[PDB]
Design a protein around this ligand. Structure first.
Ligand SMILES: Cc1cc2nc3c(=O)[nH]c(=O)nc-3n(C[C@H](O)[C@H](O)[C@H](O)COP(=O)(O)OP(=O)(O)OC[C@H]3O[C@@H](n4cnc5c(N)ncnc54)[C@H](O)[C@@H]3O)c2cc1C
Ligand SMILES: Cc1cc2nc3c(=O)[nH]c(=O)nc-3n(C[C@H](O)[C@H](O)[C@H](O)COP(=O)(O)OP(=O)(O)OC[C@H]3O[C@@H](n4cnc5c(N)ncnc54)[C@H](O)[C@@H]3O)c2cc1C
Ligand code: SF4
Ligand code: SF4
Ligand code: SF4
Ligand code: SF4
Ligand code: SF4
Ligand code: SF4
Ligand code: SF4
Ligand code: SF4
Ligand code: SF4
Ligand code: SF4
Ligand code: SF4
Ligand code: SF4
Lengths: 643, 643
């Protein structure tokens, strides 16, 4: 063993506290060490060049680096040594920055002694290291996209245009997500369906996209490039291949049920098409409401009605997964002071979006729920379900300000005589053109802004609503009457989010949305390799941000599939057949079942083993041993820590 | 000619105003028309299937669609007819929605008559159409990335990992952009350099990336897949291949000049390295300050100093371009009431970022410019250079709120006894974890928030600063004294932005940043094919949004390069040699020089012609004629409009 030690100054992060001169000499004087050097920034290109030159010249076969935590830069130095010809796993890392220099600033002498001890432990471990060849595994060039909203549609189209065969699983009968439910979009007031429908048709026609709507992902197993996914397609009771979406079955159906697309304010039949631009344009029967009258069977000319349909099980093999499951609107029923669900003329922002839509339940007319007449006075309340510790929702929903202003502008254009007032804490018009939109809400449409979080909404006997709120800029309490009140509800993770998160094995952030690998530089990656996030799945945001995230997720998922191969770490259990007695107290301790028994000896499957070391710690005789974490290595480290 | 006419209801967008029954019968009765049908949504899959079935059955050779504007759905129907075997350009579009139904709502009868006339004109044009084969052109599988900030670095790394050879042009001597200048990042307060430097090294080592720093893009010519780019590499007067970045030349240099990296508050030598983590780690001589003393030549051991270096011209051929040129910080000198550049202890947010940086000019100490001592009282002013019509800056800069709160928190941690007050209009903490960060600024660090836009900053004789501002929530004027005032300057397009925009040929938005193809669904595309935007080039935003945009831009630019081919529209000039007299009054009228003279006859180059039709309109005898816009076709349309 010819150990080369490299102590990093990291500028003054280590050097400021730890004497990189004494440590270097100590390392040079330790047994088996043939060189000790220090450099200002080893992770940089000059430092890696120095390490490679030292390996080439002095013939170092073991490399020890006294630098930051291995979790940051272990792969960097592993590749550095690889490019110089040395084996990947002859390398050792000493943590003297996060564990020594940054936590013992007031004890420089103790810090230097701790650094000496840690480098001694690292060299003790490095003495007994041996080469290990890492196995390559093929990466399937297929992707799964969960969620058929704007983000999911964008991700699927980008992957399919790059040549990868993509599956798109959607739990609703049709794709579109929440963007299909909007009438217009801010800040341009353009029609959302007019621009989304072509993309939906594209997804429906793409040769590289397999669209599975009305389906859920039930099981996910495996790893990057090698995901096995079990999907459950719910029974439509309509044949997708035969149905043309004419709608005669809907015409004849006698039963009426709520339309999920209309968000509780629209009705359809037990057999329904969610909206005219649905993709696939196919009928669906909800058996909770079907009475099995067979009128739809008799009126259908394609023979597409199948009352004996069963749920179908699909198994796919993919290489990457993109979660694009969006969000649900906050339910403000728990805000008792605002009276949602109790007062007749209190509605939410999404319900208003459905109501203002020309294709919505009311044919685009904003009408009071109480009497079906246009309101003359409308109040909007910001931050409902957001920025509120009384309900455990301390985050901003990021879009409610803008869509509140947009819907106020739309109400003004449709009914210019209407009076509109917004109750806000902050106006968060941060995006491109958002501040101009905010100013236009006042200058052009005459919308009134009151800086005050309403205390209460009181329903009067005539069903009008008094908003009781302080005007904080006038510094006085106001009680103003309105014919309609619209709650600016925030965004929450969708129903069934935890089930899918556990199925895939992802973590979630403090707000309840899925967590990205790094907040700053890996916004669309997760810590699970081969799984990516796009859109509001990662947190509330508007359509362009979700689309950018979907494109980025497509690129990130394409990178490994283009590479076609990934490396498996060889830190795995190995059994000594000559020592193993076949006691088998190790097999059950493997959560992945990597250990079996062949010829009376324990045998580990590399594909199943993950390298936890539990079995090795359990083995009394020591027949089992983990590569790179052998018992002798840890024992040497323990001995060096105290001697 | 067997013309099939298809009138779209578009739901009620046309049908509501225009009688799609009378128009269909009129079309059926017109000469050469063999079928007339109407469908609720023709652009949808069922409508395209209907059109294809009609073409296959009745043998239609001309297709006319009375629907929305051609600029929206002409490619859709072109591909629809292609997939049924018909030629792409036998297709005609009548605009009866944007031009008739949506603009004559109060005259339904006049609307229907106008629709009849427009369909008659469309059929008149379609009678004389003929097939045209479109030529394919290869797409170069190479990309250029302009700008070496976080967005540009991300885009280049994503493209290079997908296998494409990428050029990265950077005007500064080193990559990093503005993220390298930050000390920490919000909302996590993690070190920005610690996470950016590995990416910079990766860019510097990638086999698929050619990094050209200290260079500018001078000329761009051509089109998607076929861009010819002329780049000018400025002379460093240091040999990049030889320089190791040791810094001895800096040690010996006698001249002192401002360091651009330190934003006007840091000094370096005439030969300088912008920062220790620079990529490439190379020296640069600024000849505005060099006195040619040759001390650097004598102290350099690599012989890397080249005082006779000249600017170099590089010509590259690429298929896609990604603009990632970032932003500049607003210069608040024009806000005379705040006294920047006049008061000693008034600084900007970016200057404070450099000052709080441990590697900055002051070694991470926040010191007053007047006396070099720590301030005891600090004020932050929000929205400086933003949301202000007095300076023509009506937009939000979107990050100043958060980095103001972050730098206040950093000042508190470094100097807990310091008092910090923020003067704000709205707190825009919209991002993930931003509202929690905002609350933590108060609960944990005790930062004071005053809702008021300061009227004035007055320098007192002792050089302290009185902020005169209304507290609007107390409703009273306040005059508070501070040792330091930090202006929360906004983001503006970088210097030289207009030159590069004109060089490429891009448009800009109202705020001055580059304009995307569609605000909602194409945030990273431009209307110039093959050119994409990433990061703050498209508008102010934070690091994760810029990184998502960079990944999306990489994916979008990869799509056409994976396809490897694009179609050229055949709407081009054609000369009748038997009629052309070689008068040549057409050649100079082509801005692209597509027309030359061979054998005494005008000859058009397809590669140069773009299809404006100017030459055809100029030709008296009619020898020149534009394909798909022939004189006979327009004359027939004129005749049908009036008869
Ligand atoms: C009232 C309102 C108005 C708005 N107005 C605007 C506006 O004007 N402009 C703007 O830019 N933004 C607006 N937004 C925000 C915008 O809707 C979002 O940015 C966008 O919808 C996010 O798209 P997405 O694909 O990430 O999610 P979604 O649109 O929610 O789509 C997610 C999809 O995933 C599906 N799904 C969920 N769970 C599963 C599962 N387990 N398996 C399979 N599929 C699943 C859902 O059914 C859905 O189809 C508005 C939001 C609201 C509430
Ligand atoms: C004081 C301050 C603090 C901030 N703090 C944070 C924070 O804590 N967290 C956060 O997420 N964001 C923060 N931001 C915002 C963040 O800096 C931006 O989101 C990010 O820098 C944008 O990266 P970019 O690559 O788009 O642009 P830039 O970082 O500006 O990089 C653009 C690059 O293009 C180069 N370039 C320009 N013109 C040309 C040309 N013609 N040819 C070639 N190259 C060219 C530039 O030299 C530069 O290297 C802060 C901003 C400021 C001003
Ligand atoms: S190797 Fe680690 S400690 Fe050394 S400079 Fe790099 S990040 Fe800092
Ligand atoms: S089931 Fe039959 S009748 Fe109903 S929409 Fe489908 S094709 Fe039409
Ligand atoms: S069988 Fe069910 S879906 Fe069909 S018409 Fe009767 S109630 Fe409606
Ligand atoms: S975006 Fe506006 S309305 Fe929505 S939570 Fe944030 S501050 Fe409240
Ligand atoms: S515990 Fe040890 S001895 Fe027993 S079967 Fe496992 S490896 Fe063999
Ligand atoms: S190391 Fe862990 S995963 Fe591997 S065989 Fe032993 S118990 Fe199973
Ligand atoms: S073809 Fe045009 S007019 Fe007809 S439905 Fe589609 S978008 Fe509307
Ligand atoms: S020019 Fe020479 S002395 Fe100066 S940094 Fe480069 S190698 Fe070192
Ligand atoms: S020649 Fe110029 S750069 Fe070199 S030491 Fe002299 S002044 Fe400095
Ligand atoms: S982000 Fe905050 S400080 Fe910056 S312009 Fe917008 S409101 Fe003003
Ligand atoms: S203007 Fe007409 S006649 Fe004259 S050279 Fe051109 S094509 Fe020929
Ligand atoms: S149509 Fe326009 S571009 Fe083409 S040759 Fe004539 S003038 Fe030139």
């Amino acid at each position: 063993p010819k150990i080369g030690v490299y102590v990093c100054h990291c500028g003054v992060n280590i050097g400021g506290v730890v004497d990189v001169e004494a440590v270097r000499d100590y390392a040079a004087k330790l047994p088996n060490v043939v060189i000790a050097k220090d450099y200002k920034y080893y992770c940089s290109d000059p430092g890696q060049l120095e390490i490679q030159k030292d390996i080439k010249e002095l013939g170092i076969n073991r490399v020890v680096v006294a630098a930051c935590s291995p979790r940051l830069h272990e792969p960097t130095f592993r590749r550095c040594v690889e490019e110089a010809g040395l084996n990947q796993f002859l390398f050792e890392f000493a943590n003297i920055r996060e564990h020594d220099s940054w936590v013992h600033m007031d004890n420089p002498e103790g810090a230097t002694e701790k650094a000496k001890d840690l480098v001694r432990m690292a060299v003790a471990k490095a003495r007994l290291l041996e080469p290990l060849e890492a196995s390559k595994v093929s990466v399937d060039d297929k992707a799964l996209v969960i969620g058929g909203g704007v983000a999911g549609i964008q991700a699927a189209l980008d992957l399919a245009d790059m040549g990868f065969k993509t599956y798109m699983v959607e739990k609703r009968p049709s794709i579109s997500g929440r963007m299909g439910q909007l009438d217009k979009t801010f800040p341009t007031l353009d029609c959302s369906m007019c621009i989304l429908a072509p993309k939906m048709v594209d997804v429906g026609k793409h040769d590289n996209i397999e669209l599975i709507t009305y389906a859920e992902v039930k099981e996910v197993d495996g790893y990057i490039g090698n995901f096995k996914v079990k999907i459950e397609k719910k029974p439509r009771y309509i044949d997708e291949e035969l149905c043309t979406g004419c709608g005669s079955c809907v015409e004849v159906c006698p039963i009426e049920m709520p339309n999920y697309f209309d968000e509780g304010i629209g009705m359809t039949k037990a057999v329904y098409i969610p909206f005219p631009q649905a993709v696939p344009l196919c009928a669906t029967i909800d058996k909770d409401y079907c009475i099995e009258c067979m009128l739809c069977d008799e009126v259908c000319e394609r023979g597409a009605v199948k009352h004996d349909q069963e749920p179908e099980e699909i198994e796919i093999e993919v290489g990457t997964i993109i979660v694009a499951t969006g969000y649900d609107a906050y339910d403000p029923t728990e805000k008792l002071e605002y009276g949602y669900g109790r007062h007749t003329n209190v509605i939410t922002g999404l319900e208003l979006e459905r109501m203002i839509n020309a294709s919505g339940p009311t044919d685009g007319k904003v009408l009071k729920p109480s009497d079906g007449e246009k309101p003359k006075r409308v109040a909007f309340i910001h931050c409902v379900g957001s920025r509120d510790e009384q309900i455990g929702k301390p985050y901003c929903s990021r879009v409610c300000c803008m869509y509140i202003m947009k819907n106020a502008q739309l109400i003004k254009d449709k009914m210019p005589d209407t009076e509109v007032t917004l109750y806000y804490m902050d106006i968060r018009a941060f995006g491109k053109g958002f501040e101009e939109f905010y100013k236009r809400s006042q200058e052009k449409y005459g919308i009134k802004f009151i800086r005050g979080r309403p205390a209460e909404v009181i329903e009067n006997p005539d069903l009008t609503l008094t908003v009781r709120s302080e005007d904080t800029l006038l510094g006085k309490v106001t009680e103003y009457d309105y014919d309609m009140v619209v709650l600016g509800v925030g965004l929450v993770p969708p129903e069934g989010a935890e089930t899918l998160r556990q199925t895939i094995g992802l973590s979630k952030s403090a707000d309840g949305f899925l967590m990205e690998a790094h907040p700053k530089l890996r916004p669309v990656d997760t810590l699970t390799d081969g799984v990516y996030l796009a859109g509001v799945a990662q947190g509330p945001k508007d359509i362009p941000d979700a689309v950018a995230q979907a494109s980025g997720a497509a690129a990130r998922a394409a990178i490994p599939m283009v590479k076609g191969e990934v490396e498996i770490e060889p830190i795995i259990a190995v059994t000594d057949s000559d020592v193993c007695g076949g006691c088998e107290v190790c097999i059950e301790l493997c959560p992945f079942g990597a250990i079996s028994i062949e010829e009376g000896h324990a045998n580990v499957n590399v594909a199943l083993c993950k390298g936890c070391g539990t079995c090795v710690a359990a083995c009394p005789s020591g027949a089992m041993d983990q590569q790179h974490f052998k018992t002798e290595q840890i024992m040497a480290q323990i001995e060096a820590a105290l001697n």
